[PDB]
Structure 1
Amino acid sequence: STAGKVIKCKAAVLWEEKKPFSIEEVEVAPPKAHEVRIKMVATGICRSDDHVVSGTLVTPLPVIAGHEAAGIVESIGEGVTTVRPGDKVIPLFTPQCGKCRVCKHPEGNFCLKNDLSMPRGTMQDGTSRFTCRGKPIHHFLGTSTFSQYTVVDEISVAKIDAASPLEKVCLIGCGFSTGYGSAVKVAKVTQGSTCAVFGLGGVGLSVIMGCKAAGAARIIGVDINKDKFAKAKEVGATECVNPQDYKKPIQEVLTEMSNGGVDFSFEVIGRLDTMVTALSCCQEAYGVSVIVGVPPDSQNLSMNPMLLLSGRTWKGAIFGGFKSKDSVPKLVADFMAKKFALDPLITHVLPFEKINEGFDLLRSGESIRTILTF
């Protein structure tokens, strides 16, 4: 029993940008009040973790990154009432404090206690629970799951069903719920509709799964990597287009194909240009475009405001619009009742120590999701 005491264990520390993760011994403090220490069982490699390596997503370094994961409470700090040692849990990179403006609003889910808008890389009380080489290491979006153990605030953890398969439902902590909710909760794809999805990585395939669940009649997947097409058609794409095959720009190609513009489009890559392309190819009078991708830090896009004046709606969302502590238990329960599949998304399962190999698979385009098991 490790309770009440510091744990020494391995974590993958990123000491500086554009470097490999370094697997090292770190010391993890015991939880303080309202904090929970979690033994990690599986964590997915998401493209936003790679944005930290490339410097596109700015957060204080050195850092233990990792935010899509599932584990078991090893101990709870003073005052924790929503989880108990031995519970299976999913860390929440968007917290739900339940007490702010946004948590109390019926539609908002970007809680004001998040660490994404102006990242401090600490716990809610402003300190770190990690030491590595005598130095405190930063947390990432209050989750830090590339570690055998991590400590999170109570507003950042959800108890899930005790029979969940943790090496599959860790995708509900990020990729799958982000994609699925952008379609069914943020865009509100309607039955009969034509949808176009830019990007067919794990979030993008999850956006197709949500569009097909909302009853879209046509779901076009767009990617420059044609090897992604078979899995996209497998989860619901009625057709796939690769922009490099055409001589016209893809917004004209899609407008011609949809006879005037799609009803819903989704940018699920993170590029300033495909974000304006995705808005453009939706129908000018009633089209809805949803930005899901994370843009390079401090870069502005350029667009003509007449694209909106005619009637288009442009929205973005974090974590598919779901209030995270309410929604994740319920999405795991739906997965258990076979309402949606997560297995098409998992292409590689590697032990934690091959983290750097899992990232190279993401960078070379060969994986959708790699799950790392501890």
Structure 2
Amino acid sequence: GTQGKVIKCKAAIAWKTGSPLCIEEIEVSPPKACEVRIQVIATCVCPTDINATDPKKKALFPVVLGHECAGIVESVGPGVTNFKPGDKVIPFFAPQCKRCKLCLSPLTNLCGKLRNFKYPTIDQELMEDRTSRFTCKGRSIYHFMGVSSFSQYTVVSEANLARVDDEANLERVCLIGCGFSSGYGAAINTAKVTPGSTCAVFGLGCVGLSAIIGCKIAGASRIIAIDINGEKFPKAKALGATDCLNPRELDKPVQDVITELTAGGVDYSLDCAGTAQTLKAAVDCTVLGWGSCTVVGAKVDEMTIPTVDVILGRSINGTFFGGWKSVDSVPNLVSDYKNKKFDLDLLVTHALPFESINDAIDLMKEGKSIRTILTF
């Protein structure tokens, strides 16, 4: 684990699609220029990781999945000075090189670092110099979304991580790595929820729940939580939801129930589920004139919206990592948590050994968990 030397450690590898992850012993090369090798302390399983193991979806194999985590810097490549061994950090799929047009713009959190703009899931599958830091059984392993946290040690670009509070609880702040930040920021930054406004959140998993926390912090007077899984309602309400609706138990489309309940629709809707149903419902349930729909989750490649709807005032946009300038914002979210601005503990339903990663996956696929904290 010493600097400059290759590290051998446990990691979950997906040798191919539609298969369960395999606990292997891999070789993690040392960081090259502008890279940082991190000791992953805690990591969660995000549906996007599972999505990668879906035969119906495009992906690269073999690969070290995982991208939501927190850890400690083990070593930094040549020329790196903003990071040093011992620092607590949180990597993320959304880079912020701070040295490009996109990074300079206050209108986006995208970065010129990103290359693929049609399949973000298969981008950042290798380091800058198009090579991998991972090796297992003489084979080269693909990185995932610039993070690959399903390994006790991973190497990431400097543009893909932030140093956080020295006293940050790595087993909770790891949620800031993707899930929490994405939903929280979708409400605050992308949808731009305003005080006294009404909101609708579709999908009550970690993202949807964080979106609710965000709407609450933003001052929404009413937050309608929608999910086909009634179990998700208690946690939703505990986080600020004022109304809960299960499309499965309604005789009318859920968007028409929301419209009636609010006498015209909500000011802001956030789809944190992403199905054909939710995407359409998320747009329909907003008020005409100024209704705003924000796409957060997306299980489908397209959404179809009537021309008359946009003409009559409905707007549609979407988020990428909650609209946060990652490097600058992540440290702030960690501080907000330290100051108890929101409670990340309510997002953790399970905590298993890394070896039990496949069980963490099943729990999620089965919708029996929000987030499962995996530790090595």
- The TM-score normalised by the length of structure 1 is 0.97
Look up the match of 2:348: 346
Shift of 1:59: 3.2
Q: Distance in 2 between matches of 1:223 and 1:287?
A: 21
User: SS of 1:212's equivalent?
Assistant: helix
Moved more, 304-313 or 136-145: 304-313
Deviations 1:128-186 (A, max 9, x none): 10011211110011100000100001111110111000000001111111011111111
Shift of 1:270: 2.1
Q: 2:200 aligns with which of 187, 196, 205?
A: 196
Between the aligned partners of 2:318 and 2:191, the Cα distance in structure 1 is 9
Give SS of 1:302's match.
strand
Match of 1:284 among 274, 288, 291: 288
Partner of 1:64: 64
The question of whether the paired residues in 1 share the 8 Å contact of 2:187 and 2:214 is answered with yes
Verify: 1:81 aligned to 2:78, yes or no: no
- Against the structure 1 CA distance between its residues 215 and 359, is the aligned structure 2 distance closer, same or farther, given a 3 Å change threshold? same
Alignment partner, residue 221 of structure 1? 225
1:174-213 correspondence runs (5 A): 174-213=178-217
Q: Is the 8 A contact 2:183 2:322 kept in 1?
A: yes
2: distance between equivalents of 1:155 and 1:8?
A: 25
Report if aligned partners of 1:186, 1:317 keep a CA contact under 8 Å in 2: yes
Q: Deviations over 1:306-352 (max 9, x none)?
A: 11110111000101000100000111011111111101100101111
1:356-371 equivalences in 2 (<5 Å): 356-371=358-373
Aligned equivalents of 1:107 and 1:84: distance in 2?
31
Asked if residue 233 in structure 1 is aligned to residue 237 in structure 2, the reply is yes
After superposition, give the CA deviation of every residue in 1:40-69 in whole Å (9 maximum; x if it has no partner).
100011111111112465332211111110
In 1: Cα distance, 2:101 partner to 2:191 partner: 22
Question: 1:10 and 2:10 equivalent?
Answer: yes
The question of whether the paired residues in 2 share the 8 Å contact of 1:48 and 1:57 is answered with no
8 Å contact kept, 2:288–2:312: yes
Deviation of 1:112 (Å): 2.0
> Is 1:143 matched with 2:147?
yes
Whole-Å separation in 2 of the counterparts to 1:72 and 1:245: 46
Q: Where do residues 33-52 of structure 1 align in structure 2 (5 Å cutoff)?
A: 33-52=33-52
**What pairs up with 1:92-171 in 2 under 5 angstroms?**
92-114=92-114, 117=117, 118=119, 119-120=122-123, 121-171=125-175
Query: Partners of 2:23 and 2:307 in 1: how far apart?
Result: 48
- Change over 3 Å in CA distance of 1:349–1:56 after alignment to 2: farther
Deviation string, structure 1 residues 220-274 (Cα, Å, up to 9, x no partner): 1000000111110111101100011111111111111111011100110121331
Q: Does 1:91 align with 2:83?
A: no
Contact 2:38–2:155, Cα closer than 8 Å, also in 1: yes
Q: Is the 8 A contact 2:53 2:59 kept in 1?
A: no
1:112/1:343 Cα in 2 relative to 1: closer, same or farther (>3 Å)? same
In 2, distance between residues paired with 1:108 and 1:150? 28
Structure 2, unpaired ranges of 5+:
none
1:57–1:109 Cα change, 3 Å: farther
